[PDB]
Amino acid sequence: TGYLTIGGQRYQAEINDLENLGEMGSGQVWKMRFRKTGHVIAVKQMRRSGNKEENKRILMDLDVVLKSHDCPYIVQCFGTFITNTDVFIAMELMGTCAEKLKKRMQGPIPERILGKMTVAIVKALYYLKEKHGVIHRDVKPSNILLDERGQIKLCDFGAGCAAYMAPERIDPPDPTKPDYDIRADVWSLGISLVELATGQFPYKNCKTDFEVLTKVLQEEPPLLPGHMGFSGDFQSFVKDCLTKDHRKRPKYNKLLEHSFIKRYETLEVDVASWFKDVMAKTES
Ligand SMILES: *CCC(=O)N1CC[C@H](Nc2nccc(Oc3cc(C(=O)Nc4ccc(CN5CCN(CC)CC5)c(C(F)(F)F)c4)ccc3C)n2)C1
């Protein structure tokens, strides 16, 4: 009926072996308890479509995550249940995402955390490209998961305004070869880092979608501000990510040589204590 693979063991399981502990999203996501082991997991319910080429597209995506167990920086999938109407996708529970951390913080996430985040997300994206030939296409804070153990992982969860699309994805310069590649995700990462480092959307004061898309195309990229004490290597990293000319934008292997990443690979940062200190903080 469905198989859950948890901790090297494959359990036969039915949809009723899952006890519902409530919703986590707002497609629908539930916190559930697998009755056989007691594990508390995250489960996404999606409607299946009548288009069997679209069902194939989404199962191909999940196939990738199912085979991404050897990447420490990609959220773990335990398996799926398929009915006529629905696909249930079961994952390790991560406590929250960087989008919800920002709203709880009401302000910036510190650089030492974003440094660790950056190492994890770049390595996850690189892994997806190198091992599975796959581009994420939707890098943004709501797809960056954090937990109590200090892990940071890439997922796909499903005035001022959000916009994460690279210029070449908004408006391809070559109509003959219109496909954006991995550098579009590099840009999205840059935008995500600026948003999380500042606590504010980088593109500000926008009336319409057409205005916002227009801003990305003609404005200078919004870099980290220079008055907030950000390290030179962090500013350089973000600026390299937010190169408008995609032909000049670094690929992942180049980003993995950047000083910012090298520094945060080996620096001890207690993300777990910070995360907990954040969740337990009683000053408003
Ligand atoms: C902001 C989020 C939030 O509020 N919360 C609250 C708590 C919740 N925790 C949690 N923990 C684990 C999982 C989860 O949500 C889910 C996520 C997935 C999931 O990540 N699915 C996938 C699917 C596909 C991919 C890879 N694709 C490659 C192709 N491209 C397009 C071409 C798309 C991506 C991935 C990836 F990237 F590899 F990781 C992930 C599934 C189910 C659930 C429940 N929430 C977070």
Neighbour-count burial for 41-53, b at 16+ CB within 10 Å, e otherwise: bbbbbbebeeeee
Q: Is 134 in the pocket of ligand 1 (CB under 6 A)?
A: yes
Experiment used for this model: X-ray
Look up residue 247 and give its DSSP letter.
G
Residue 253 in tokens: 């292997």
Coil, helix or strand for 119? helix
Tell me whether residue 133 is annotated as binding: no
Half-sphere exposure of 238 (CA within 13 A, CB side): 24
Residue nearest to atom 33 of ligand 1 (CA): 136
Tell me whether residue 105 is annotated as binding: no
Instruction: Pick the atom of ligand 1 nearest to 44's CA.
Output: 44
Tell me whether residue 122 is annotated as binding: no
Domain residue extents for the chain: 2-92, 96-280
- What element of type H or E holds 210? helix 209-218
CB atoms within 10 A of CB 172: 14
CATH number among 3.20.20.140, 3.30.200.20, 3.20.20.70, 3.30.365.10, domain 2-92:
3.30.200.20
Residue type at position 72: P
Please state, in angstroms and as integers, the Cα–Cα distance from residue 279 to each residue in 97, 147, 152, 276, following that order: 13, 11, 16, 5
Do 96-280 and 2-92 fall under one CATH topology?
A: no
Question: To one decimal place, what's the resolution in Å?
Answer: 2.2
Q: Is 241 in the pocket of ligand 1 (CB under 6 A)?
A: no
CB 55 within 8 A of CB 49: yes
Q: Does domain 96-280 have CATH number 1.10.3720.10?
A: no
Q: Is 144 in the pocket of ligand 1 (CB under 6 A)?
A: no
Could you tell which of 6, 34, 65 is best to mutate to test the pocket of ligand 1, judged by most ligand atoms within 8 Å of the CB? Answer: 65
CB 15 within 8 A of CB 2: yes
Q: Is 91 in the pocket of ligand 1 (CB under 6 A)?
A: yes
Residue 274 in tokens: 């910070």
- Residues identified as active-site: 138
